[PDB]
Amino acid sequence: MQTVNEMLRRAATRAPDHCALAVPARGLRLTHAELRARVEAVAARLHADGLRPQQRVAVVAPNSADVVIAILALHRLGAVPALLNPRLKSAELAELIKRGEMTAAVIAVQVADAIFQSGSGARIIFLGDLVRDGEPYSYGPPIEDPQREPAQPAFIFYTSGLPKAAIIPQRAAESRVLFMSTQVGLRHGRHNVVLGLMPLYHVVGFFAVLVAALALDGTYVVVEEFRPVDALQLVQQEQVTSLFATPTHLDALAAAAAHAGSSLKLDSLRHVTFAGATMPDAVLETVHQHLPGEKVNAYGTTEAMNSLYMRQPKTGTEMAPGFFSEVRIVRIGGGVDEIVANGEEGELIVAASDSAFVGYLNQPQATAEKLQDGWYRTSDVAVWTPEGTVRILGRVDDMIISGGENIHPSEIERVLGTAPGVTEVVVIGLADQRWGQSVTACVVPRLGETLSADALDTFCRSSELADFKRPKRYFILDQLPKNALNKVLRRQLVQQVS
Amino acid sequence: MQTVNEMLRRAATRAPDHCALAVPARGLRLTHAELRARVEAVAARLHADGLRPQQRVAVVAPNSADVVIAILALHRLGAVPALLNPRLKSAELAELIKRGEMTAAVIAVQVADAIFQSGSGARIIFLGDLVRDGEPYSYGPPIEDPQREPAQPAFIFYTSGLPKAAIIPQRAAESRVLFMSTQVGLRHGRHNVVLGLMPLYHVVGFFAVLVAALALDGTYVVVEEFRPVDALQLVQQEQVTSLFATPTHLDALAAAAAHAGSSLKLDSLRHVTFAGATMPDAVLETVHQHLPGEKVNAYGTTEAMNSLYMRQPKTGTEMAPGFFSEVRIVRIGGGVDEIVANGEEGELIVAASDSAFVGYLNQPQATAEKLQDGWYRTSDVAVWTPEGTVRILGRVDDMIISGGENIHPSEIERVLGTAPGVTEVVVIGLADQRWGQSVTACVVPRLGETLSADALDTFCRSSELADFKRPKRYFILDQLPKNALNKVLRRQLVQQVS
Numbered sequence: 001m002q003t004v005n006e007m008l009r010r011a012a013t014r015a016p017d018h019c020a021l022a023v024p025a026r027g028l029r030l031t032h033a034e035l036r037a038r039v040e041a042v043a044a045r046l047h048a049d050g051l052r053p054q055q056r057v058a059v060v061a062p063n064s065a066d067v068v069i070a071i072l073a074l075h076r077l078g079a080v081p082a083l084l085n086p087r088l089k090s091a092e093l094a095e096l097i098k099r100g101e102m103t104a105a106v107i108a109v110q111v112a113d114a115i116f117q118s119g120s121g122a123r124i125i126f127l128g129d130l131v132r133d134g135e136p137y138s139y140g141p142p143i144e145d146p147q148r149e150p151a152q153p154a155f156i157f158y159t160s161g162l163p164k165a166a167i168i169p170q171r172a173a174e175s176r177v178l179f180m181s182t183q184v185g186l187r188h189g190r191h192n193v194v195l196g197l198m199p200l201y202h203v204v205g206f207f208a209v210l211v212a213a214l215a216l217d218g219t220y221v222v223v224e225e226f227r228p229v230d231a232l233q234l235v236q237q238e239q240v241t242s243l244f245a246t247p248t249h250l251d252a253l254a255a256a257a258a259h260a261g262s263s264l265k266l267d268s269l270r271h272v273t274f275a276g277a278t279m280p281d282a283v284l285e286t287v288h289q290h291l292p293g294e295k296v297n298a299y300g301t302t303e304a305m306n307s308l309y310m311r312q313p314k315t316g317t318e319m320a321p322g323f324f325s326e327v328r329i330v331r332i333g334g335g336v337d338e339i340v341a342n343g344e345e346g347e348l349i350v351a352a353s354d355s356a357f358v359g360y361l362n363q364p365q366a367t368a369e370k371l372q373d374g375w376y377r378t379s380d381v382a383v384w385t386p387e388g389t390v391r392i393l394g395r396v397d398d399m400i401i402s403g404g405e406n407i408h409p410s411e412i413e414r415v416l417g418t419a420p421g422v423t424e425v426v427v428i429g430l431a432d433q434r435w436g437q438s439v440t441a442c443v444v445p446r447l448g449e450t451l452s453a454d455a456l457d458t459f460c461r462s463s464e465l466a467d468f469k470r471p472k473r474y475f476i477l478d479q480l481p482k483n484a485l486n487k488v489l490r491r492q493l494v495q496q497v498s
Numbered sequence: 499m500q501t502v503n504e505m506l507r508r509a510a511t512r513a514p515d516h517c518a519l520a521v522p523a524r525g526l527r528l529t530h531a532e533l534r535a536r537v538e539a540v541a542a543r544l545h546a547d548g549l550r551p552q553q554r555v556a557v558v559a560p561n562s563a564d565v566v567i568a569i570l571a572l573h574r575l576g577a578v579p580a581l582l583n584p585r586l587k588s589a590e591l592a593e594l595i596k597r598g599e600m601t602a603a604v605i606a607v608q609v610a611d612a613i614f615q616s617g618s619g620a621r622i623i624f625l626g627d628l629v630r631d632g633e634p635y636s637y638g639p640p641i642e643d644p645q646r647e648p649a650q651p652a653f654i655f656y657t658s659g660l661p662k663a664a665i666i667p668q669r670a671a672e673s674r675v676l677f678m679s680t681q682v683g684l685r686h687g688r689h690n691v692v693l694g695l696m697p698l699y700h701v702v703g704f705f706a707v708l709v710a711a712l713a714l715d716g717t718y719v720v721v722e723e724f725r726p727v728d729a730l731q732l733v734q735q736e737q738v739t740s741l742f743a744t745p746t747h748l749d750a751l752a753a754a755a756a757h758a759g760s761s762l763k764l765d766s767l768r769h770v771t772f773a774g775a776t777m778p779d780a781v782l783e784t785v786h787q788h789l790p791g792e793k794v795n796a797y798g799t800t801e802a803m804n805s806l807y808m809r810q811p812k813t814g815t816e817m818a819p820g821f822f823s824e825v826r827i828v829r830i831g832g833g834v835d836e837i838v839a840n841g842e843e844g845e846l847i848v849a850a851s852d853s854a855f856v857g858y859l860n861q862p863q864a865t866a867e868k869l870q871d872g873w874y875r876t877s878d879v880a881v882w883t884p885e886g887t888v889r890i891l892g893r894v895d896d897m898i899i900s901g902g903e904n905i906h907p908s909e910i911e912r913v914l915g916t917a918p919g920v921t922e923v924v925v926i927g928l929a930d931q932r933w934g935q936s937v938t939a940c941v942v943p944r945l946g947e948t949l950s951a952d953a954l955d956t957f958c959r960s961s962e963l964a965d966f967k968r969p970k971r972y973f974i975l976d977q978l979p980k981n982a983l984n985k986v987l988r989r990q991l992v993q994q995v996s
């Protein structure tokens with residue numbers, strides 16, 4: 001295998017004086033050699049404080065040169081980084097670190113108060129005490145490089161109840177990186193300038209963006225806070241070659257690009273990648289119109305990384321498997337061998353091979369639901385298009401079944417979201433009748449505007465929606481319950497209105 | 499890990515009806531699904547005949563759809579293919595199969611007589627008895643897929659005394675393929691049409707060309723016999739996207755392209771790759787002038803596959819390490835830690851990691867000379883250019899040392915090869931004086947022409963060669979002893995003239 005540490009180590013020998021990390025904000029740059037030296041010193045220092053291989057260390061911080069150093073430091077030492085969204089509640093993080101039987105928690109954030117106070121036996125470490133603006137606090141001699149095994153735990157990332165801790169084995173790193181090469185077209189070389197828009201607590205943010213940038217002997221441009229025009233300036237100033245960004249980021253960037261024109265020079269940008277299954281047609285339309293480079297839509301999971309893709313996508317929902325991947329669509333709640341007839345909907349399952357997680361930390365029931373007989377079960381519904389591509393319909397858990405009929409709220413949400421006066425819409429099935437459940441739309445109006453159940457129904461009737469798909473009821477609301485990091489709490493909304 | 503068989507298996511699920519193998523000669527095409535079915539049937543059939551996993555099977559055949567089937571069949575069964583240049587002597591092949599304690603030999607070639615007659619206990623199998631023009635002889639039920647281990651032997655390839663049998667472990671396949679992606683820029687997709695110019699008994703021919711083509715869900719175009727204009731027609735007719743070819747092939751192709759013009763449409767060709775360390779400037783010049791696509795010079799070995807490269811090369815001798823690779827230049831005949839001062843010549847050594855061979859079959863002395871402390875020793879001399887790239891000088895074994903001075907015959911050969919009237923030149927050091935050895939040129943004249951020691955000396959004196967580098971003596975010959983498959987027997991030549 002080639003571990004993260006090895007990939008970065010090897011890169012450093014090939015390009016020791018090339019720029020690894022650029023923070024144009026802080027006027028900060030570090031070469032590959034310089035980035036190693038800090039990874040080594042922060043490593044030795046943690047090791048001098050008692051930290052040993054295989055011990056789990058929480059990391060809770062916004063993106064920064066300093067957290068990159070700390071994370072690779074931890075990995076280099078041998079410890080297992082558990083990367084947590086800093087947007088979680090104090091209560092939630094404290095609980096996850098408690099449940100994770102974690103040895104320490106590297107933080108930058110009162111959240112510190114909470115950890116102490118949860119009972120958890122985790123030594124609270126402030127990121128600024130380890131490294132500041134790329135400058136580490138050094139003490140102790142250099143340390144061993146511990147032996148790493150292919151199935152051994154390497155990194156922990158959390159899913160989208162509470163988030164589950166997916167364990168990423170050592171042998172997963174390489175294909176978690178190289179799919180950026182086989183699917184997206186990135187190649188080895190110092191031409192590589194990669195914009196760090198994706199957060200580091202997400203597997204794409206970490207493997208596909210940070211580690212890929214360094215392992216191809218390129219440069220990772222750190223972004224602490226996303227501002228659309230600022231980011232487009234970075235593309236121009238840094239000669240950015242690729243960006244991987246969220247649907248929301250791209251909408252921002254496309255419109256700023258449009259309301260710029262050839263004001264900004266974006267020619268260096270050859271790759272614009274995104275997980276755009278949930279991306280509305282209109283945004284995608286603006287992406288092709290107003291941003292340069294080859295566009296690649298990508299489908300993946302925390303659990304198995306990349307499973308599908310499309311170069312130059314027409315819709316955001318249909319994609320095909322790439323290198324490393326093997327995929328099936330099976331009857332919902334059936335065995336991994338129950339393939340569906342072509343054109344019938346089912347669950348997307350992907351082979352659980354090198355890139356796959358080895359289980360959810362301390363949750364073997366969840367694991368046995370998800371890893372069956374060598375497959376990973378996405379919980380996503382899909383259909384095989386006549387063109388031989390996979391169309392993603394929505395989550396199994398959001399699927400409304402009304403009068404014995406599969407209805408996917410995301411479809412309806414895409415239609416309703418275009419209705420004049422609508423700012424947000426979530427479609428849910430109410431425990432009810434006609435039967436099983438009834439299609440219900442919950443809609444927030446634009447600032448100042450009214451909405452009408454009647455007018456929205458009229459709008460739907462003029463749309464493409466098949467009859468049975470149309471909402472039977474409308475609730476107009478000032479707000480949707482969003483404390484799963486935005487993400488709507490579909491379950492909790494149902495409770496609120498029923 | 500992802501083994502050859504797995505890479506091809508997975509591809510077949512993603513692209514079952516896409517064309518895997520095209521033989522435009524025989525008007526033959528096979529989809530990925532169809533190629534699996536024959537691999538399975540030839541597998542079961544060999545297994546029904548007694549063949550078991552880990553048993554070594556010799557393969558001696560020119561390139562063809564049929565040998566591709568047989569080789570993958572053997573691999574799929576579990577047997578270990580030992581691929582041998584069909585241009586070797588009957589005596590030599592019989593001896594290698596004897597030494598290789600090989601269970602059977604799949605052949606297409608009197609060579610059959612010799613094997614029987616060498617004592618060797620190897621069941622002689624004619625390729626036409628297993629599969630004919632893509633059509634296999636089937637019998638027996640389908641068979642198990644045997645368990646494969648990362649360090650377990652997978653394939654045997656022979657070096658350039660007699661050829662040594664380098665054992666290629668299961669875990670080597672992936673990076674032996676994916677360097678075509680990280681260095682050369684190939685990406686996954688059915689756009690991939692790969693021209694099979696390289697022979698299948700060479701690791702590039704096999705991993706970088708055949709397996710890469712199929713594993714990226716593309717098409718391998720079979721070429722039984724290389725004809726320059728024919729091959730350029732194939733590019734046009736088949737929409738070839740990449741070719742990997744020898745220096746000799748490219749010279750042919752460039753001149754045929756030139757003596758064609760836009761007669762031939764070559765636009766589909768995006769990648770022209772070559773191992774061009776020994777490639778003369780003039781040929782390279784014609785390659786950039788007359789062939790399209792990005793040109794990539796690549797350095798590699800049977801033992802460790804790809805170790806260096808250059809996009810858009812200016813000379814053929816200077817290259818830089820890519821993804822997977824780690825490299826050093828050490829003092830000749832010294833420890834792997836004896837790095838040289840920058841600008842001093844030494845031996846190129848490359849880290850022995852996933853892609854590396856695990857040893858030479860039945861030759862542990864040779865192995866211990868070659869695999870030391872985690873490195874693979876190339877036996878090639880190199881220098882680090884001030885630009886931070888590796889300049890390959892020539893083999894350690896051809897290096898002439900005259901008056902305590904390193905002289906590389908390939909350099910002198912490149913100069914002398916341009917001298918009017920010279921068809922071939924080999925430079926050797928004669929056991930002699932001034933001292934140690936004396937630089938001697940052996941030159942074959944062009945058909946009908948004379949050569950003069952005096953005129954060649956005059957030519958050299960007008961060249962770039964530093965004084966001490968100039969040949970002290972000239973032997974004009976009608977022929978150079980070439981029975982190491984062309985390749986000159988430098989040792990044997992020395993004997994002839996001394």
Ligand SMILES: O=C(O)c1ccc(Cl)c(Cl)c1
Nearest residue numbers: 275298299300301305306
């Ligand atoms: O969380 C996701 O959507 C996700 C996770 C991993 C990958 Cl590779 C992708 Cl393309 C998407």
Ligand SMILES: O=C(O)c1ccc(Cl)c(Cl)c1
Nearest residue numbers: 773796797798799803804
């Ligand atoms: O035999 C060679 O020259 C050779 C072997 C393997 C590779 Cl990858 C290359 Cl680029 C060249």
